[PDB]
Each structure stands twice: as C-alpha cells, then as structure tokens.
Design an enzyme around this catalytic site. Sequence first.
Site, PDB file in Angstrom:
ATOM      1  N   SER A 130      -8.531  -1.364   3.393  1.00  0.00           N
ATOM      2  CA  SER A 130      -7.552  -2.273   2.799  1.00  0.00           C
ATOM      3  C   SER A 130      -6.262  -2.286   3.628  1.00  0.00           C
ATOM      4  O   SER A 130      -5.812  -1.246   4.124  1.00  0.00           O
ATOM      5  CB  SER A 130      -7.228  -1.823   1.378  1.00  0.00           C
ATOM      6  OG  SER A 130      -8.400  -1.397   0.708  1.00  0.00           O
ATOM      7  N   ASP A 168      -1.624 -10.819  -1.900  1.00  0.00           N
ATOM      8  CA  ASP A 168      -1.764  -9.405  -1.568  1.00  0.00           C
ATOM      9  C   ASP A 168      -1.322  -9.156  -0.127  1.00  0.00           C
ATOM     10  O   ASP A 168      -2.148  -8.880   0.742  1.00  0.00           O
ATOM     11  CB  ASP A 168      -3.233  -9.006  -1.743  1.00  0.00           C
ATOM     12  CG  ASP A 168      -3.441  -7.515  -1.723  1.00  0.00           C
ATOM     13  OD1 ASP A 168      -2.436  -6.776  -1.667  1.00  0.00           O
ATOM     14  OD2 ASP A 168      -4.617  -7.086  -1.776  1.00  0.00           O
ATOM     15  N   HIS A 172      -1.120  -4.130  -2.288  1.00  0.00           N
ATOM     16  CA  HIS A 172      -1.591  -3.091  -3.190  1.00  0.00           C
ATOM     17  C   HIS A 172      -1.566  -1.725  -2.527  1.00  0.00           C
ATOM     18  O   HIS A 172      -1.314  -0.722  -3.183  1.00  0.00           O
ATOM     19  CB  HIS A 172      -2.991  -3.408  -3.727  1.00  0.00           C
ATOM     20  CG  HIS A 172      -4.095  -3.190  -2.743  1.00  0.00           C
ATOM     21  ND1 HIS A 172      -4.250  -3.959  -1.611  1.00  0.00           N
ATOM     22  CD2 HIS A 172      -5.118  -2.300  -2.737  1.00  0.00           C
ATOM     23  CE1 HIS A 172      -5.322  -3.553  -0.950  1.00  0.00           C
ATOM     24  NE2 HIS A 172      -5.865  -2.549  -1.611  1.00  0.00           N
TER      25      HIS A 172
END
Length: 277
Positions: free
Chosen positions: A225, A126, A70
């Site tokens: 992230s 992911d 992402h």
Amino acid sequence: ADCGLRPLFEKKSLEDKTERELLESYIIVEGSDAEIGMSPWQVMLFRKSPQELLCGASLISDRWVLTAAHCLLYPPWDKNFTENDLLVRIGKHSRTRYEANIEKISMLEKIYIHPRYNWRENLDRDIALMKLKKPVAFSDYIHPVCLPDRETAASLLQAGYKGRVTGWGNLKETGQPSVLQVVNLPIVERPVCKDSTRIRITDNMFCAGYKPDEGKRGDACEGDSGGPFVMKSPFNNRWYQMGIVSWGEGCDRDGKYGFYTHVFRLKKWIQKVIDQF
C-alpha cells in the site's frame, strides 16, 4: 523533469525482462524479484520505534514523496503518524539488509493528507504527500517517476493495458520477500471492478488485475500500500505513476481485484500543495 528515465535502463538504452509485456499490451503475490534499479523511484515508509516497514511510496522529486493516505491516517485503528514517527528509505533493494552506499534515509518535513480523504467509507481520494527535511541525491538507484497529465492519462489508462506494481509487501494473505518484488497487471474495466465488490467505487480509483479465465494471477498485498502502479509511455519511453496501492479484499482472490488511487484524477491537489510551498 528528467523524471521517468531510469539510470540503469533507459539512460543505458536497456530494457528489463518484463518491460515489453507492458508495451505489447497497449492495444506482491505471484510476482518476481525486481532487477537492480528497475524501480529507482520506489520508496519504503519505515516506522522509527519500533523499527518496522509499514508501507510503500514513491519519490516524485528530490523533495517529495507520494503514498496512500490510509498508510498514514486511519482512525479506526488509532493510526495517526507524525513527521518524526517515521522515516523514508530510498534506493533500497533487499527488504532487510541496510544497503550502505546505495540507499538513503530521509526525514520528514511535513505530512500532507488529502483534505477529502474518505476513510469512514471507501478510502476515496486515498492519497498523501510527504516533504523531506533534506533533499535527496539522485543516483543510479534513486530516481523520480513522472506524474501523469491529460494526454498520458488518456493514452495509457485503459482496460487491458498493463501497469506494474512493485513492493516489499507480503507474498500471500496473512512471509516477506528479501528483495523488492515486481508484477505486471492489466487495468480492469470499471463496470467489472464495480460489481466485483460490495464496496462503493469512485472515479478517484481504478482497479487492475487478471480475470478468473485468463490463467495468470498476481496482486498487491499487505506492505505494498502507498506503493506505485506505473506504465511506460510508448511515446517518450518514460515511466509514469498512474496509481497508488490503495485497498482490496484479501490478496489475489479469484474474481477479486486490487484498487488503486487514480493519481491523475487528483493531480490538481498534488500540484496545489507542492506549489503552495
């Protein structure tokens, strides 16, 4: 190869202030200033123009970087970076200063996003790799983390077991630290992770984090992230990346948990793309 063995620690037969918190458990909000070179493999996804930090990542070899998918690809917000929209800073420590003869700025050769990465529903798979135009030089500050394997996975990826998450992300819910942060969190049992959120879970993802009655707190947040979730194997004193900061609802919300891409469960892919080139 010489992966997982930190220059300013293992190589020098030393331990960091939170290392044993992990060991003693084998049966970035609320973190702490990491110590120099205690997360040598840590990486920073940087955006060229405008200049801005957009994610964390990890050096898993002089020529390859690992991060969340992402971070790079997410249609909902018209996000779709390219090899030269970004930069990767390695060996950093301070979130802002340009550590001259320490960090190393590398360019991108190719971006590789997982073919089955699911953004329409729950960031399933992911994960994403990044080849570097030019190989990086290892120093006491820039070193690779290991990739898990059958054994390693089975031994360390268990509920209660604590892993570590480092990053320059936010310190709360939306500011940023002036130096890489570190926090140690415990792996939560899938069932709990599941009914902790109304989002559909997958085996390609696990969740770490403390429970409401444990007292302690901590979690990852915006900017972390793509960053690593590691564990030191008691067996060979090596550090492995067991996850990747993926998603979560808020940041350190009671009875909420952070979700991480389950690296080993997708090591097959990783191996594939790296061998194919």
